[PDB]
């Protein structure tokens, strides 16, 4: 609407130009506002050629939230691509490029996750979108455990309590986070409590100005703001399929490309800062840059619709314009920085991938190694904490910086 509202003013300022015309100074204006109109043309033209790809890619987001969120990376892509497929051959269109771990997510939002230890990874994304959004209450599997630091961490703000199902106080704690509404999280499921099938069936009773939902013999008033997380740790844990239909499934368990994925990232981020800076600020460059370019855009905009009659301020339009053509140039660099990420970029993913699969063999090799003694039990958070050790704190590299070394070192050691 605000871009149909530009179109408007600019048939105005066309307009005002040939009554200025009825006079080379008009005729540059006209051409100049001819071009700029040509802009605006094309800027409409993307985005009616943009609404194809959003409902494409509401329908394949949305099936990707509801369905697929228990299954591994592989099962997840495989349903994706069946889905695309299947798109493709229907003729509805929708943007490939695009990635679901952004499209519904937001900057702000992926920032406050990796300040709340959010362990950056394909798995880790998808399942913090889904836990996000939602209209029935998650089911996180955690083995690793990782999604209970990070739940603590993302709502230490609105105060989020720990509480068991084999707690004798889970009763209070529940009718507590019903009445004021906090947030909660129950670690332990295996031994199910039924007293949570009227709430996860969200059977509230809206009468009078009271939101009510039965539990037990007592009505309890529900709050907007109540939310109730269920956590189990065993990932061959059963449940019965009430269950399994009232509570969406969101895993956090480390299949092996997911842990390859993690170590790849964590190298990343160690070793080489300015890629994975670039990556960080490869959406920042459609981020960061586009902000300002949208800031730009809109300030432009409200010049153009504020002039009141500025006569005597008119570069100011030639300046913006200007503005925004650098920064659209700035974007379509970014865009042949993003070939060069394709050409060298993805070069250092794959350079860095041997070690990565070296360190997913690893783990893979401990948790079988849990099997010919009892005494042989290690968990993630150890590996984790050897490979923080062997990239930071570490002397054989304190002198080192050739990256292609410190590569071999980092693997050594």
Same mark, same amino acid.
């Given at each position: 609407?605000?871009?149909?509202?530009?179109?408007?003013?600019?048939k105005?300022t066309?307009?005002?130009?040939e009554?200025?015309? *009825?006079?080379?100074?008009?005729?540059?204006?006209?051409?100049?506002?001819? $071009?700029?109109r040509?802009?605006?043309?094309?800027?409409?033209?993307?985005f009616k050629?943009?609404?194809?790809?959003?409902?494409g890619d509401?329908?394949l987001? $949305?099936?990707?939230?509801?369905?697929?969120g228990?299954?591994?990376?592989?099962?997840?892509?495989?349903?994706?691509?069946?889905?695309?497929?299947?798109?493709?051959?229907?003729?509805?269109?929708?943007?490939t490029?695009?990635?679901?771990?952004e499209?519904?997510?937001?900057?702000d939002?992926r920032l406050?996750?990796?300040?709340?230890?959010?362990?950056a990874?394909?798995?880790?994304?998808?399942? $913090?979108?889904?836990?996000?959004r939602?209209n029935?209450?998650?089911?996180?599997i955690d083995?690793?455990?990782? $999604?209970?630091?990070?739940?603590?961490?993302?709502?230490?703000?609105?105060?989020i309590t720990?509480?068991?199902?084999l707690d004798?106080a889970?009763?209070k704690?529940?009718?507590?986070?019903?009445?004021?509404?906090?947030?909660l999280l129950v670690?332990?499921?295996?031994?199910?409590?039924p007293?949570?099938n009227?709430?996860?069936?969200?059977?509230?009773? *809206?009468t009078?100005?009271?939101?009510?939902?039965t539990?037990?013999?007592q009505?309890i008033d529900?709050?907007p703001?109540f939310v109730?997380?269920?956590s189990? *740790?065993?990932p061959?844990?059963?449940?019965?399929?009430d269950?399994c239909?009232?509570?969406t499934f969101?895993?956090?368990?480390v299949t092996?490309?997911?842990?390859?994925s993690?170590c790849?990232?964590e190298?990343?981020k160690?070793?080489?800062?300015?890629?994975?800076?670039?990556?960080?600020?490869?959406?920042k460059?459609?981020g960061?840059?586009?902000?300002?370019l949208?800031?730009l855009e809109?300030?432009?905009?409200?010049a153009l619709?504020e002039?009141?009659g500025?006569?005597?301020?008119?570069?100011?339009?030639?300046?913006?314009?200007e503005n925004?053509?650098?920064?659209a140039?700035?974007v379509?660099?970014?865009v042949?920085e993003?070939?060069?990420?394709?050409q060298?970029?993805?070069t250092?993913?794959?350079?860095?991938?041997p070690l990565?699969?070296?360190?997913?063999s690893? @783990?893979?090799?401990?948790?079988s190694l849990?099997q010919?003694?009892?005494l042989?039990? @290690?968990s993630l958070?150890f590996?984790?904490?050897? @490979?923080?050790?062997?990239? @930071?704190?570490?002397?054989?590299?304190k002198?080192v910086?050739d990256?292609?070394?410190r590569?071999?070192?980092?693997?050594k050691?």
């Amino acid at each position: 609407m605000h871009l149909n509202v530009g179109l408007r003013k600019i048939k105005e300022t066309v307009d005002q130009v040939e009554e200025l015309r *009825r006079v080379n100074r008009s005729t540059a204006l006209l051409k100049s506002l001819s $071009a700029e109109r040509e802009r605006w043309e094309k800027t409409s033209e993307t985005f009616k050629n943009q609404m194809s790809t959003i409902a494409g890619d509401c329908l394949l987001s $949305a099936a990707f939230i509801a369905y697929a969120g228990y299954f591994d990376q592989q099962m997840r892509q495989n349903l994706f691509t069946t889905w695309s497929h299947h798109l493709q051959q229907a003729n509805i269109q929708f943007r490939t490029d695009i990635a679901r771990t952004e499209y519904l997510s937001n900057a702000d939002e992926r920032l406050r996750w990796q300040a709340s230890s959010l362990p950056a990874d394909d798995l880790c994304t998808e399942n $913090a979108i889904m836990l996000k959004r939602f209209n029935r209450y998650p089911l996180i599997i955690d083995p690793s455990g990782q $999604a209970t630091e990070f739940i603590m961490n993302e709502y230490k703000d609105r105060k989020i309590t720990r509480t068991s199902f084999l707690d004798d106080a889970f009763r209070k704690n529940l009718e507590s986070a019903l009445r004021f509404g906090n947030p909660l999280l129950v670690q332990d499921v295996e031994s199910y409590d039924p007293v949570l099938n009227p709430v996860l069936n969200r059977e509230v009773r *809206r009468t009078g100005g009271r939101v009510l939902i039965t539990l037990g013999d007592q009505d309890i008033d529900l709050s907007p703001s109540f939310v109730i997380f269920l956590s189990t *740790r065993d990932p061959t844990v059963e449940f019965p399929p009430d269950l399994c239909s009232r509570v969406t499934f969101v895993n956090f368990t480390v299949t092996r490309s997911s842990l390859q994925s993690q170590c790849l990232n964590e190298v990343l981020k160690a070793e080489r800062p300015d890629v994975d800076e670039k990556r960080s600020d490869l959406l920042k460059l459609q981020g960061e840059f586009q902000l300002r370019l949208r800031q730009l855009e809109k300030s432009l905009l409200q010049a153009l619709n504020e002039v009141k009659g500025r006569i005597l301020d008119d570069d100011t339009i030639i300046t913006t314009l200007e503005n925004l053509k650098r920064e659209a140039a700035e974007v379509t660099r970014k865009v042949e920085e993003t070939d060069i990420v394709m050409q060298e970029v993805e070069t250092v993913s794959q350079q860095y991938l041997p070690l990565s699969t070296a360190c997913s063999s690893i @783990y893979f090799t401990m948790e079988s190694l849990k099997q010919i003694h009892f005494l042989y039990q @290690y968990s993630l958070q150890f590996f984790l904490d050897i @490979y923080h050790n062997v990239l @930071y704190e570490n002397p054989n590299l304190k002198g080192v910086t050739d990256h292609t070394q410190r590569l071999s070192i980092i693997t050594k050691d």
